[model samples]
Target chain A: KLVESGGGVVQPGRSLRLSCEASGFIFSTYGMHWVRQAPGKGLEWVAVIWFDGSNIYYADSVKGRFTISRDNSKNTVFMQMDSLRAEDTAVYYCHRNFYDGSGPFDYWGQGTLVTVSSASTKGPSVFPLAPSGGTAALGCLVKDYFPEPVTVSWNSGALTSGVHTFPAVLQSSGLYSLSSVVTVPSSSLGTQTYICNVNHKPSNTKVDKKVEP
Target chain B: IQMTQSPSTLSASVGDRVTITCRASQFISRWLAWYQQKPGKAPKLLIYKASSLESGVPSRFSGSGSETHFTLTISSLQPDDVATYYCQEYTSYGRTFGQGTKVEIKRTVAAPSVFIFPPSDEQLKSGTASVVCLLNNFYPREAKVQWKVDNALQSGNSQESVTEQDSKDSTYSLSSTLTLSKADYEKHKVYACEVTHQGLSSPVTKSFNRGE
Candidate 1:
């Protein structure tokens, strides 16, 4: 069996190290390889240390920043990374390859989740509008935010209901964009005041927009 | 970096000796490995480091050669050995995998049966329609499904499900669905589902009319 250890929420530019402990087999006789998966991304090969620790191979993507090593007596393999970035946040895993790196990886370690919080986060921009040809559904566009997990609430004297908030989508600029819609009576559009509130945790800020039609 | 495998498809009988070769664009020393993959499953490691057989593998499976060229040989091919094989070179920064070599046992093959289903009236009235294509009972399990509207390829709107093989017959079955807006579906004259498989000399296509 293989078990991985180490992971935590960290700020950007911080260094981190992870390890994998092996048992039920001779750890020194098999090679240890590391693989990682980013949020909503496919698995990626990282690096590998050969049996006896004579050689190591790394994927070009992480060549200089990532390192792989092992301690046979403890049956543990180590992976370290320096100068982490937001993109470095991923679930790292370790697997055992055939002796001297021959055959496939037969044993695997449970992965560890490492999240690198964005160093500089941007707050949300809220806009109040109505959908084309529809005034019964009041729309709020909350966009241009960084390092997600934002709460969007509609307030009209009290918290409103029938609000549908969509998932945040990452834009090309590395920011997040989302929209929320609240259903109200068509006659209430011009009579009531609606406010859209956006709370972004990373930035520790809140922004709101009020629409009085 | 590129790794190329020769004889993209191979046919051999049980107990016959089978060999597959892989060549790298540049010299990679002994930093190479071989894997076997069955349909709908992950690839299994077979050999590594030019010629080292992974533990728990059968004795009949062996690897050889170094540098840019390498070969994987099965001393006596068995019925269970029919699968796609790939070679990977991990010498430097960029690791590359071969296109893959499929091994099939010499036997009578079965062609896939294709069927297409159009959207219901409720779906049409809803402004969006989904068309489904079902393929069943094909041997060798290697196949491709594509959607075309009036002979033009449709992109990013089709999804193919995992292929399932029968435990007793060893045949494969799969389905593909294409989603279209009502306007897009009505504007097209004919929508076709195309099936490409090793069992057929030409692709089999089934069509559905706009109203049908």
Candidate 2:
């Protein structure tokens, strides 16, 4: 149960990759799928491909430039897009397409947050370690529309001190904003509660929210 | 609970009859509905609350069913009517859906990204180098996943298009495995992922070559 909602995002005119992988279940056979939700919209399927790369089906009324691919060696399927839009501002995800319709994503990647900001771009790519419950290192999407500068705290608290943070790739947003990839021990995601806080210093506005993939 | 999709892909002439089936978590006995989706367009609610119709649905679409099982029947399926259909279970909130049955028309006015697996660059190392082409994000049934070593459909079993059911959302992802030798994989092999859904030519193929 990795992705429940709002997992990933992409930038305009850029390609995005989102994936979901799982192990442990004795799956006789299974599939993978790609779905997209333009910001604030419902789930609209882009297409579905089989494990063998056999067939790709575009809905009767789909638009242009969306594709699905996979890496069997890694049991990882990826979805990519080119030339995006604000309407492309939504959560993208990759799940195991099963035999029956609307099946299980038994294993999910913590949903990736993709913002189609000219300022930035991110993919919903998933990297599942062999063990589900082990040391966990994760990143979050904090669309920094404003530069006031805020701190992302883990375990539901302000980064009191000594929090290790790394700078995220400056997307093509062509703006002056940065994202921090926060790494926490597997314990924080498994045993402790983590929250990302944005303290709008210049305006003295602060917001803290729970983080889940 | 068990979930399955029938006629993974179906072809129907304009004004033909089409039906979608959804198996249940248990058996809501009268708590299910169906949904329709098109590429780029949001999933529209066609039928809801059992056999009741969702407001604003076109007259061409109709539904009927009860309990754990239900059906979404489209009368006179049209060309613009081509899309993926899935059944929903609301008898329970965890809302479960069935493997989707894709509906296609005999002729395509335009190509949508709804069901297309564009070929990608395949780079194989050595060994019995098999290039696995994953049909990501598609739905229902056992579709084929193989490559044209030399313009031949190399057959092999693939992952069972599986699904997960609960109260929230459902997924229908499947996989196909294509095994190849090092020589074949590097020789500009063209792989095609074809599905027998709705109405289209046979299956569309995406070509690729092995790169370093």
Candidate 3:
């Protein structure tokens, strides 16, 4: 049950290795599986690989960057992840999956927690689309940010109105992106300019932008 | 979401009859299962589809009950039976496992019985051979297994041990294995397994020779 969970630290954009070994029963007697749980979150099934290293099925979110394999001589299973990210900092567990679909994961190894740090964010890429009839519709978008709970604000000097923010969603690349919209009457567009303010938590930086025409 | 179990822990000893119950919140129609979990290990499916025991499980372990009420009974408890047992409902929208009922071994009185699986003449002649010394019915929970070649203690080589419960008469079976080469066995006629347990001052010895 020895794992490098807490002690293992990999920087973002690097690769990570996780291993599990069992000796109680015959190695080939059962199938092996991998699962993970993010900090303070519930369990998520990652994938399962046969003892003989046959076929494998991974969660859609993990299928792209993770590879699963086993070592027959040592009765060990291994998981490798490329381009690691902060979200990859989680407790990973290896266990046996029951052959019957009746149930899965009745046994589990102590989980390993891997950390990915030193990765700053890319952008609060603000873009202001053309105004529609009588309304100057504006959008504030951010791309490729890490370790969230970001706060994005809208301000139009003294008018402070018509702000709508969407929930932050996890992108396929493990980064977060958020979009907020502000609508102002076309009549006030030339006289009153609106600004998009973003406060990204991980990098602790802020970006302020003005609506373009 | 439909079933629940009670009497979280049951205290018993070898050869003692015991039963654990699972009650459904409502009529769930015999869609339950029974699983057992040893400390630190995953659960093993015991009885599935309510009363049908899983393949290879002993007959002494039985399950019975209707839609909303169920029971898992062991005619006699074995030493290895000391663990947590759970009942699950598989017919609901999602599956659910009962809290669990733990059966603790309250007494310790069992003698170790040994069996040997030895290599044949042809296997020994192959230059390498493997053998398993199956030690059975050992209780009071602990034992030491040692190996010898021509009665000379062998070192640096480790043995593998597997413990199982015999529900029929309530006992424990622990097996260990030792592998050797034909060249070594040819020089040493007697390959033996010496088992020392809490019940014995003198270790029990069982051996296998080339001729037999």
Per-residue CA lDDT of candidate 2, range B1-212, in tens? 44554657787666788877666657677766566766433355576666767667887777676655666778886556767777655442133456677665543332211111222222133233433233322323234444555567665422222222101112133333344555655564455555443223466554444331
Q: Tell me the tens digit of each residue's lDDT in model 3 across B1-212.
A: 44578887777867888989899887778788787766434456688777888777899899999878999999987776777788866563334557677676654567765544455444455575555455555565577888887888876554443433433344555545455677766666788888888777688887767575
- Residue B126 in model 3: lDDT: 56
Give all TM-scores, in the order shown. Answer: 0.46, 0.33, 0.34
Give lDDT tens digits, candidate 3, residues A19-74.
87765554454566676656544345577675534667776667788998866777
Put the candidates in DockQ order, highest first. 1, 3, 2
Q: Model 1: per-residue lDDT, tens digit, B1-212?
A: 77878978887767899999998888889989888865433456788788888778998999998888899999998877777888877676445677778776654578876666665555567686667666666777568888999999988787554333433444555556677889988888788989998888899997878753
Instruction: Give the worst 10-residue stretch by lDDT in candidate 1 chain B.
Output: B161-170
**What residue pairs are clashing in model 3?**
A5-A113, A107-B42
Query: Candidate 2 lDDT, tens digit per residue, A6-56?
Result: 233344676665565544342324555555554324454556665533666
Off by over 4 Å in 3: A1-213, B1-104
Stretch of 10 with least lDDT, candidate 2 chain A: A123-132
Tens digit of per-residue lDDT, candidate 1, span A8-35: 6577888889988887656344677787
